[PDB]
Amino acid sequence: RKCVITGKKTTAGNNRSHAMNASKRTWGANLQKVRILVNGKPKKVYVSARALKSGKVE
Amino acid sequence: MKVIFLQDVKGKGKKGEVKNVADGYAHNFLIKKGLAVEANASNISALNGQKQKEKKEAIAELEQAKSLKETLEKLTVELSAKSGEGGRLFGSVTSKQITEQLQKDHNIKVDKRKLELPDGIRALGYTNVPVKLHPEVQAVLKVHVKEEA
RNA sequence: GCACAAGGGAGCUUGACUGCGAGACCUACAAGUCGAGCAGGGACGAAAGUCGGGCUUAGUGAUCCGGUGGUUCCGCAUGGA
RNA sequence: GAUAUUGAAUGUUGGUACAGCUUGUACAGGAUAGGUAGGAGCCUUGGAAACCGGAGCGCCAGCUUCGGUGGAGGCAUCGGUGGGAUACUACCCUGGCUGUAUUGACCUUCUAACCCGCCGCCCUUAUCGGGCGGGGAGACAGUGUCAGGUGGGCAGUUUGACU
RNA sequence: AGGCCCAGGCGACUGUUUAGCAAAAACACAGGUCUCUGCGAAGCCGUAAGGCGAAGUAUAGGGGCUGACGCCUGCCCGGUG
RNA sequence: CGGGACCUAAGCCGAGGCCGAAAGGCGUAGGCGAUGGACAACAGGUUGAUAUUCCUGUACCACCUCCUCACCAUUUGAGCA
RNA sequence: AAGCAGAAGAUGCGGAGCCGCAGCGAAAGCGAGUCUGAAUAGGGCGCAUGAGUACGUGGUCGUAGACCCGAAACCAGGUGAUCUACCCAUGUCCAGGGUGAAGUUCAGGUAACACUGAAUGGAGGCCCGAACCCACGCACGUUGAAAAGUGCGGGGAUGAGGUGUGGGUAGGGGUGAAAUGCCAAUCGAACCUGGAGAUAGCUGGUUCUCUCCGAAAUAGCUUUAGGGCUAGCCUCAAGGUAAG
RNA sequence: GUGGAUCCUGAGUACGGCGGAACACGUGAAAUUCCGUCGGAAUCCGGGAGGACCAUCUCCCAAGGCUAAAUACUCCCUAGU
RNA sequence: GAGCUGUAAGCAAGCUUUGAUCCGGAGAUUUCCGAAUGGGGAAACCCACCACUCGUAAUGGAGUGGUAUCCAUAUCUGAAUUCAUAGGAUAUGAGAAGGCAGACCCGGGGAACUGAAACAUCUAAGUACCCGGAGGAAGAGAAAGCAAAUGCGAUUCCCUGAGUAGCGGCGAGCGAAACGGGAUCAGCCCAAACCAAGAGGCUUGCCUCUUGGGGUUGUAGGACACUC
């Protein structure tokens, strides 16, 4: 699960409950499968909401 | 989100009303296929350009229209006798085409569709007034000279 | 242990005080206990002089953290916080 | 659940200023006594009650703002009415609504996202996926972040001493 | 190359299990019952792609309980689910 | 004769691809994979060790043509598949 | 000191830095005084009763595996389904003898149908019993022929059957007609390497000699009772010196 | 090197909310850096830091890159201790 | 420059002053597996296609060289729908892969035992271990800094600061930095402004893209007018 415009991907962090008990978890970026250009060729590929926010081509 | 309207789309607006509309309604609707362009985009400049161009053009055109409303004014007396007979009676038929004919008497031509006279003109010979009505934006000052045959 | 009141009654009063404290008891440590005497202001009584809570021994707990009041303390370049 | 992907539209709906609100009801009682910055104050033909009545305001008093038989009609504490009877700044609405930009839910739509372990063609001697077209759903779901509930399915631990 | 007979518990029966102490009254069983699931069924493995379920479709699959057959399976929904 | 240059089952691998922190998991085309399918030699002799393999007589299978004869037409095309 | 020269040396340079010569207070701050406090009162703290520093040996402590041997067990990464459990694909085995189902033909029977009797028929997780498989009883064996057998009897033996070959399921798992069964003679959580010299308030052991002195098994507190800290008791040294 | 009308000096970036991680620093007064989601600036009269935070002052110009020596380590080779 | 065909002791034998054996530098051969790469596979094997040679009357057989995938460039083609793109075809590439030194450096992922005399915050420890990536060293780097003074001027490493300031069920424990003294010493290049052109869409510069001038700066600098 990558983003083809930026290096966004899953990263690991620790879930901490009350009493601060530590449990390992994961953090996923907000990817979306969407139909866009990569070269002049169009394509369907992953992209993040943040990346889409900066007005990219569909 | 702001985008050039491009065309007229109901509430959307009319060509030229580039506005900041919500995404999707734009990128995923209006922009795709439909009229659109995003005012925020550099195209905004192209827009301004073409728009100003056309506007200035047309305005100056109407201005020169009032200009020739004056142009044809100093005109030499229109000497198109309308077959004046039995005094005021005029065998000749006076109407707007009649006026424009009295007109092309040296060369210049006009369009009979510009006359301004509600009532038909009484078939007289007097100072037949002819308020040239080329366009709403500019009428004109004139009074052709009917004559006797 | 107390009828020379420490038991009972009346009037006044808030020492059921602040700063302390020579010495001593008890003690592994932590703590616990008594303490004359000094100063500031009192209460009682004319005065002497007594009063630093119950007639003596139980009625009560560490540190950390947090709350509240006073602070002539510190407060990260300086003034504030 | 909130938010991003994620919106169009009508109707039901919080605001911001535009037109303004009236007797602005103490047992009593001329009408229904909230701002006495002139309380001793004018108006300038132009029609009054008006078969009967007002969008409106009282456990049916009427009011002033006007309506299908209305051309001069008139309170101010003082004939039988008291505290400041508030009668020609422009009051805060006594809190009322209309036409105007914004917010939530129910509605239906579609392109238009997103989805399709539905169909036709091609990539292609391919039941993978992917390009088009059609069709069905549909701003939902799925997925990302956060939040609450449930949760021996799973994990780390505790469960005292004398005797 | 069968000892047999009479009775009684338990289990209907053939079968299966603690290799290497225990072969049974334990497990299974066909039968019965309750409950879930309208099909990208539910349930399950996996993170997810993928699958099994099933190239199956409530006369089918999953789960709980009881266990041929015969007669039956009463009352209580206060509590927990 | 058994197995190869013949075939495929389960399963495995797997170009593109789908998914996944990375390694990798999955899987289409396609390939691998006998324990199966198809497939022409057998009965006597022989030494110390081998024998349907070596020798003896008879066979059969696939393919090839320096060659031989019988036939068809060398585009109203014979033959091949 | 680092560092620079210097036979991996000594020595030279290197004054950054560190400990004392002043302490009191939380601190501002003051200073042989200072803190408390209204106090020039009292009391606490080193006053006044001035040696520390650098290095070496030795005792002991602290962090390091710390004195040496020993756990059951935990976690990370891999290797195993040639045994065994289950499953998939494809082959193969089961001497012999009994019982006699369902249907079907004939005859009778009936209006027709039911039905009745023969003949045929050949079904069964059917019966008896070899191969094969299982392991119920007894004996022997028990430093055995054998790390689970042998001898004589037993049970199934056409089925939910036995069995060959090729494959799949891998341990915070897999399989399980369900015993905590099996997963390479190991299973209430396999095996191999690493963290790892895990930790062990527990058990064992700890090596040459002589001399001086020489205990305790008690109090208090302790998730404390066979452990530990302080006190008592022992020893060595420097002082007070005559307290005992 | 003088002048300083006008222009440029790194945007979904800094920074903030939410939940995490690294800073010796465990959410604490918590500065500073980075990650995932969402929100989201200014352009020299401008911006960031000086351990919350504000003001004055001091220092500095992020959101673009390259940059040797001092430093770390021996499967090796050569000569030695 | 004189014994030598090793280990090893053989005579059946032969080479050596026409310079051996031996030692060093550079070359050639280097079977078959192995990233293994023509295809397959159970390592050390089996069967191919194409080009050219050996060989047969031909079939059979042999020798040499190519034939994996992905990525880059170029060319041809460019379905559906034949604008056009995937897709397909050909050619050119000392291109990648895989190994390694059980070391070192970056990162991505990330334990428990144990200490706390139990135990969950914490510790062990961002250690062990797994994964990716290059280097001979790597990371770091020329200030949106350190610091508060008649101030210093890239990073890195050594002593010192200091077991201090701090953090911490304020427990167990963890724990710096700057000033100072040393080794070493390198500072540079861009984007932006504007100029030039060529870049066409025109909606006459709003964007091209390649160069150069234009430039790398904080008591501001550069574009822009005045200087080699």
CB-proximal positions of chain H, under 7 Å? 12-13, 19-21, 26-27, 35-40
| Resolution to 1 decimal place, in Å | 3.4
**Which residues, at least 6 apart from B92, have a Cβ–Cβ distance to it below 8 Å?**
B81, B82, B83, B84, B98, B123, B149
Please give the single-letter amino acid code of residue B36: A
Cβ proximity of B21 and B37 under 8 Å: no
Round to whole Å and give the CA distance between B36 and B19. Answer: 10
Separation of CA B46 and C1' H53 in angstroms?
49
Shortest alpha-carbon distance between residue A25 and chain B (Å): 34
Q: Residues B112, B115, B119, CA angle at the centre, nearest 5°?
A: 125
Strand D within 7 Å of which CB atoms in A 4-23? none
* Closest among A22, A28, A56, A21 to A42, alpha carbons compared: A56
Backbone angles phi, psi at A25, to 5 degrees: -140, -165
Residues forming beta bridges with residue B20, ordered by sequence position:
B2
Rg (C-alpha) for chain B, rounded Å, is 25
- Overall size of chain B counted in residues: 149
Strand D contact with B25 (CB < 7 A): yes
Placement of tokens 């009979």 in the chain = B112
